[PDB]
Design a binder for this molecule. Structure first.
Ligand SMILES: O[C@@H]1[C@@H](O)[C@@H](O[C@@H]2CO[C@@H](O)[C@H](O)[C@H]2O)OC[C@H]1O
Length: 324
């Protein structure tokens, strides 16, 4: 009774983010086995990002990404593309020179059309624009925004949809799970985009949280308002970081409670189509390096053994299945 088996019975996808070159890891066999056994949706953690897939202005490298897609297809998993427009991990040919509006727009269009067309029909969901909103509730002053203005967002979606009209295009961001200044800006942004015919098919909530969880009432209401905009909802990069000092047992218990609650709420909203963790084993996680003093934020420990949260999630899924 794996997570993906339960997911399939609830008509949703449960997955993870695949680490760079997972096929050549010292423990590739084990990593791949746990992955194929538990999940039915895969997001390449980095190998579909600009610096890897488009290393030079006129050169593309789809090699690593194709291996992610190949693993997914062979193991009956759908692919979640990530990400077409972001301010980080951009190549030197982009950040190392000055651009004018028209020039950067042509670059953006070429990148998007080339990548989306290359995987047409093979990537079901694309994170078209990632983190375009500041933590102040305004447009993030990225190279894209400063050079082009806010229209780069609308255009990215329009161009992606032209390249693959069947792909579900979403806006992805962090700290917008609850109703707050940031999510309010995102809500109004997407509302206006769809009002003018922009193909924003869904919204992605990264869900990079900690053992303290979230204000669940706010999360519930926020999910409902976005769903009412006619959006499909995706929990995209979930992890629940815990401190690496006090009582691990206590923190893992809280972690399990948080996961169970998040799943409970998500499953209660028909608009949520998938839930993915930003990885699945604490052996391979970005958290320890980004959040000082924290870690052990995933489903399995360093030895691929299920943690309390894994069972808590499975329990919730089983409960929902029986309720309906
Ligand atoms: O180097 C990668 C990191 O950038 C990180 O990936 C980022 C984390 O923040 C999210 O909002 C982004 O969408 C995601 O791409 O973790 C994986 C590292 O390999």
């Amino acid at each position: 009774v794996s997570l993906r088996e339960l997911a399939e019975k609830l008509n949703i996808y449960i997955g993870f983010a695949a680490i760079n070159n997972f096929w050549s890891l010292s423990d590739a066999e084990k990593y791949m086995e746990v992955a194929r056994r538990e999940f039915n949706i895969l997001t390449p953690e980095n190998q579909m990002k600009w610096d890897t897939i488009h290393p030079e202005r006129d050169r593309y490298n789809f090699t690593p990404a194709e291996k992610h897609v190949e693993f997914a297809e062979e193991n009956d998993m759908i692919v979640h593309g990530h990400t077409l427009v972001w301010h980080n991990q951009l190549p030197g040919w982009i950040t190392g020179r000055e651009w004018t509006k028209e020039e950067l727009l042509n670059v953006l269009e070429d990148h998007i059309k080339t990548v989306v067309s290359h995987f047409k029909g093979r990537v079901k969901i694309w994170d078209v624009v990632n983190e375009a909103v500041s933590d102040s509730g305004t447009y993030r002053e990225s190279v894209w925004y400063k050079t082009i203005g806010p229209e780069y967002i609308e255009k990215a979606f329009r161009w992606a949809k032209e390249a693959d009209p069947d792909a579900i295009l979403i806006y992805n961001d962090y700290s917008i799970e609850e109703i707050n200044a940031k999510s309010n800006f995102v809500y109004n942004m997407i509302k206006e985009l769809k009002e003018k015919g922009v193909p924003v098919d869904g919204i992605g909530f990264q869900m990079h949280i900690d053992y303290r969880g979230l204000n669940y009432d706010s999360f519930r209401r926020n999910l409902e308002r976005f769903a009412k905009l006619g959006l499909q909802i995706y929990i995209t990069e979930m992890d629940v970081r815990i401190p690496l000092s006090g009582s691990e047992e206590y923190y893992l218990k809280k972690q399990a409670e948080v996961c169970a609650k998040i799943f409970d709420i998500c499953l209660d909203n028909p608009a949520v189509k998938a839930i993915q963790f930003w990885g699945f084993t604490d052996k391979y996680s970005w958290v320890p390096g980004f959040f000082k003093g924290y870690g052990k934020a995933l489903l399995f420990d360093e030895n691929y053994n299920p943690k309390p949260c894994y069972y808590a999630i499975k329990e919730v899924l089983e409960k929902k299945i029986e309720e309906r």
